[PDB]
Design a protein around this ligand. Structure first.
Ligand SMILES: *Cc1c(COP(=O)(O)O)cnc(C)c1O
Ligand SMILES: *Cc1c(COP(=O)(O)O)cnc(C)c1O
Ligand SMILES: [Ca+2]
Ligand SMILES: [Ca+2]
Ligand SMILES: [Ca+2]
Lengths: 454, 455
C-alpha cells in the first residue's frame, strides 16, 4: 500500500538533503519514483514528468536502458564481487580503465582509481596530493584552494572544498587547510569590467591568496570546469589559460572536478578538453555510469603517477582502498554506458541539442525584465532572476522566486532545479534529449515563469 | 588476451591496497577473478579456490546467487536510479529502511541514511556527531575517541579514526580532533594481568584520556564490537559493559562500527546484540548486501534523530547528501540479500558452524609451539604466530610468517588473509560454510602451516 510506504518512509528513511522534521511529520510530502523511460519519469501516483535535470546531472543516456540492465545482470550473475586488493582484478575493471584513458581522458593521463561517489573520489584526490608532497619532502605544501560557490561533495574534507555555505553549517567547515578564492561569474563582476578585465581580477585575487598563504604551502587548486550546483556558470573566455599559468608558476597541482562535466555533458569528452585544461588529476562520477550503478573514478597524470610509484619503492604499499573499489557490477554498468554514449554519439547530440536549448531559452527569456541572465554551455543552462535587471539587484530571498517557478513547473509535469545560490533555475536534461523535447521543456518553463511573474 | 588484460591492468588500473610500482612493473603478479559459486571462486586460468575470507568479510551469503542478480536486474530495468533528495524515494529503499530497523537493528534505533562504503558511512557519523553538538549549543564537544588497531575506513577523517599506521603514513593523519585509546587485546596486555584486570586497565586508560582532553570536548567514541582488520580480536569478557558505563557517565556518544560484525557474522544480528552494546549510532556495509552491490548505512537512535529533527526546525535543511544515496539497484540487492540470510537462517548457521570453526582451530593449532594464540567468535577466527610462545615474542617481521602460510595455503587452493598488524592469519568464510567445509579449510591451513613451520 502506498500510504503505508509513505509512513515507513517518514518513520525510518533519513534522506539526503531533506528537511528532517518537515519530512518526518508529513509537512514536506514524499514522492516515490517508480519508473522511467527516455527523459520521462513516473511517480507512484502515475504522474509522468519530463526530467530536465536528468536526476542530478547524471542520467545522461536516459532512463530505462534495458541494455545496461542486461550488462549489470550478466556481471552480477557471473561474478558480482571480488576485491581488487593486492593486484586482484576483474575483466570489466581492466577494460574500463584502459577505455577511460584511451578514449575519454585528456592526453598525459595514465591510471584510474575507483570509488562509488564524487565525494569519495575528491577525498582520494586530497589524500593523493598530501602523499605526493610528503614523498617529495615538502611536508608543508598541503593547502587546497577551491572557489566560492563550488560544489565538490558532502563529507568533511570534500564539504570544505565545497564553497556553498549549507554544506558548512553546523559541521565546523571549512577545515583550516582549505582556502576559497573568487567565483568566476562575469555577470557578477566588479561592476564594469570587460571579460578580460574580470579574468585579470580573478588572477590577481588568486595571486593575493597565494602571497598571503605562501606558494610553498599550497598543494593544489580544485575546480569544476563549469560550475554546476553553484549556479551553472561557464568560465569567462581566457580564464582557464590565465589561471593555469598562475598555478604552473607556483608549482600548484590542478584538480579538475569533472563530476558534472564528464562524459559528454558539455558537448566535449570533458570540461578539460572543452576549455584546454591540463589537469594533474581528474575526478569523475555521475555520467560515468549515467547513475545505473554507483561508480566514481580518480584519473591520474603520468607526472603524479610517477611520484606515486616512487613513494611505493621508498615507503612500500600506499594505505588507500575501499572494499568496493572496482566493483565488477558497477564497472560493467560503466562499460555499457560508454558503449551507448559512443555508439549514439551523445557527446555530439549534447553539443547540437545543447546549443538549441541555449537558443530557445534566450529567445523565450532573454528579453524579460525579471530575468537577469540566461547562460549555459552544451546541455547545461540556467535562468537567473533579478528584481531589478538593470541595477543587477536580487529579490528578497524570502520571496523564493526560483523555488516558486520550479514548483509551478513541477505541477505542469516538468522537473527543473532551483539552485541553492540566489534565484536560479537550472536545466541539465539527459544527453538523448531531442529538439522537440527542448521546445516542450521551454514551453512549460515559460508558462510556469509567467504564472509566478504576474 | 589474458596477457593483454594483465598489461592493460598494469598500464592503467590503480588498485586499492596494492604496491604501485611492483604491480605496474610486473614484480607483483596480478590475479583476475572471473567466477564463483558457494564458498569457491575461480581465476581466469580456471584454478578454483576456497575463499575462507569471503572477499573481504563481505560475501556472506556466498558467491553466485542468481536470486540476487535477478533482483538487481529487475530493479535496474524498472528504475535503476532517481535521487532521494527533498523527500524523494523509491520503494526498495523504503522497505529496506523499515526492515533494517524492525528486524536487524537493536531496540531504540529509528532512521537509516545510505551511502556506498563503510568509509562514507563513518564520514556521515562524524558529521552527525558534530551537527548534534552544534545544535545543542555545545560547540567544543567535538573530539572523537577511537582505538589502537581499529579499522574504520580509508579517507582523511575515517583514516584518522582507523588505528593502523599504514592508513596514516604520508597522509598527515590522524587529524587533531581524533584521539586513540588502547587496543582491547588481552593477549597483548601489560604482562600478567587477568582478563578482568586488563578490562580495568582499558577503563583507566580511557578515564585518563577523558580527563586530559576534558569530557566537555569529547563528542563520541567509535569502535568495532570485534576488531576486524586489526587482528580478529574479540573483546575481553566484561569490556563492553565497563566501557559503556564510562561513556554514559561522561555523556559521550557511542558509535558501533558493525561493518564486519553486521548481518549475522558473529551468530547474532549485530556485534551490538551479541555483546549487549547500546550504541547511539551504528555503521553498516559489507554483509548489508553481501557485496552484490555497494551499499552502506548509518543507523540512528531515537535520541539522536530527535536532535536532528530539532536542528532542522531551528536551522532548516541539513546540508548532507550523496548523489547515489539510496540507490535503487543497491537497495534491491540488499533486500534479496536479507531475504536469503533470513530464509536460510544464516545467522544461526554462523553461530553453529562458527563455534565449530573455533573448536577445530583450537584442536588443530592450540598446542603448537609457534602459535601464540587462537581466537575468534562466530565466523571470525585468527591464528597469531610467535617465535617464542611462553615469552610472548614475535618473529622478525621481515620473516613474514603469516604471509608465508597464506601463500602456501593459496597454492593448496585456500584463501586466508595475512592481516596487516602482526603475524596473523585471519579467517572470515561465508556464512553458508558447512562444518565439513570448515574441516576441509582447517586441514589445508594445517598442512600449509607445517610446511612453513618446518622451515
Ligand atoms: C554531485 C557532485 C560531487 C559529489 O558527488 P557525490 O556522488 O554526490 O558524492 C562532486 N563534484 C561535483 C562537481 C558534483 O556535481
Ligand atoms: C572494511 C571496513 C570499513 C570501511 O569499509 P569500506 O566499504 O572499505 O569503505 C569500515 N569499518 C570497518 C570495521 C571495516 O571492516
Ligand atoms: Ca501552471
Ligand atoms: Ca533466478
Ligand atoms: Ca593439501
Amino acid at each position: 500500500s502506498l500510504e503505508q510506504l509513505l509512513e515507513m518512509d517518514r518513520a525510518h528513511f533519513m534522506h539526503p538533503s531533506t528537511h528532517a522534521y518537515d519530512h518526518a511529520s508529513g509537512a514536506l510530502p514524499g514522492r516515490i519514483i517508480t519508473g522511467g523511460k527516455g527523459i520521462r519519469i513516473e511517480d507512484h501516483e502515475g504522474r509522468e514528468y519530463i526530467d530536465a535535470f536528468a536526476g542530478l546531472y547524471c542520467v545522461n543516456i536516459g532512463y530505462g536502458r534495458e541494455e545496461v540492465a542486461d550488462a549489470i545482470y550478466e556481471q552480477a550473475k557471473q561474478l558480482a564481487y571480488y576485491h581488487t586488493y593486492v593486484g586482484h582484478s576483474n575483466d570489466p575493471v581492466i577494460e574500463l580503465s584502459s577505455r577511460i584513458i584511451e578514449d575519454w581522458a585528456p592526453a598525459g593521463m595514465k591510471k584510474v582509481f575507483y570509488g562509488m561517489s564524487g565525494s569519495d573520489a575528491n577525498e582520494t584526490q586530497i589524500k593523493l596530493v598530501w602523499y605526493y608532497n610528503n614523498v617529495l619532502g615538502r611536508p608543508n605544501k598541503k593547502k587546497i584552494i577551491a572557489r566560492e560557490r563550488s560544489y565538490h561533495g558532502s563529507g568533511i574534507v570534500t564539504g570544505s572544498l565545497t564553497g556553498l555555505p549549507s554544506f558548512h553549517q553546523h559541521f565546523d567547515l571549512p577545515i583550516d587547510r582549505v582556502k576559497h578564492t573568487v567565483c568566476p561569474h562575469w555577470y557578477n563582476a566588479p561592476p564594469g569590467m570587460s571579460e578580460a578585465q574580470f579574468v585579470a581580477y580573478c588572477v590577481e585575487e588568486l595571486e593575493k591568496l597565494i602571497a598571503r598563504e605562501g606558494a610553498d604551502t599550497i598543494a593544489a587548486f580544485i575546480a569544476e570546469p563549469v560550475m554546476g550546483t553553484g549556479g551553472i556558470v561557464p568560465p569567462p573566455q581566457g580564464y582557464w589559460e590565465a589561471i593555469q599559468a598562475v598555478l604552473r608558476k607556483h608549482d600548484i597541482l590542478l584538480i579538475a572536478d569533472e563530476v558534472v562535466c564528464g562524459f559528454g555533458r558539455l558537448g566535449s569528452k570533458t570540461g578539460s578538453e572543452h576549455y584546454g585544461i591540463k589537469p594533474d588529476l581528474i575526478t569523475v562520477a555521475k555520467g560515468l555510469t549515467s547513475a545505473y550503478a554507483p561508480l566514481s573514478a580518480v584519473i591520474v597524470s603520468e607526472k603524479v603517477w610517477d611520484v606515486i610509484e616512487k613513494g611505493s619503492r621508498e615507503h612500500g604499499v600506499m594505505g588507500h582502498g575501499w572494499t568496493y573499489s572496482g566493483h565488477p557490477v558497477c564497472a560493467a554498468a560503466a562499460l555499457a554506458n560508454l558503449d551507448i554514449l559512443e555508439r549514439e554519439n551523445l557527446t555530439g547530440n549534447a553539443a547540437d541539442v545543447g546549443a538549441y536549448l541555449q537558443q530557445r531559452l534566450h529567445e523565450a527569456f532573454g528579453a524579460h525584465p525579471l530575468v537577469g541572465e540566461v547562460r549555459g554551455v552544451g546541455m547545461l543552462a540556467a535562468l537567473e532572476f533579478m528584481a531589478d535587471k538593470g541595477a543587477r539587484t536580487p529579490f528578497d530571498p524570502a520571496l523564493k522566486v526560483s523555488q516558486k517557478v520550479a514548483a509551478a513547473a513541477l505541477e505542469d509535469g516538468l522537473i527543473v532545479r532551483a539552485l541553492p545560490h540566489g534565484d536560479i533555475l537550472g536545466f541539465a536534461p539527459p544527453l538523448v534529449t531531442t529538439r522537440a523535447e527542448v521546445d516542450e521543456i521551454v514551453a512549460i518553463a515559460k508558462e510556469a515563469f509567467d504564472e509566478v511573474a504576474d
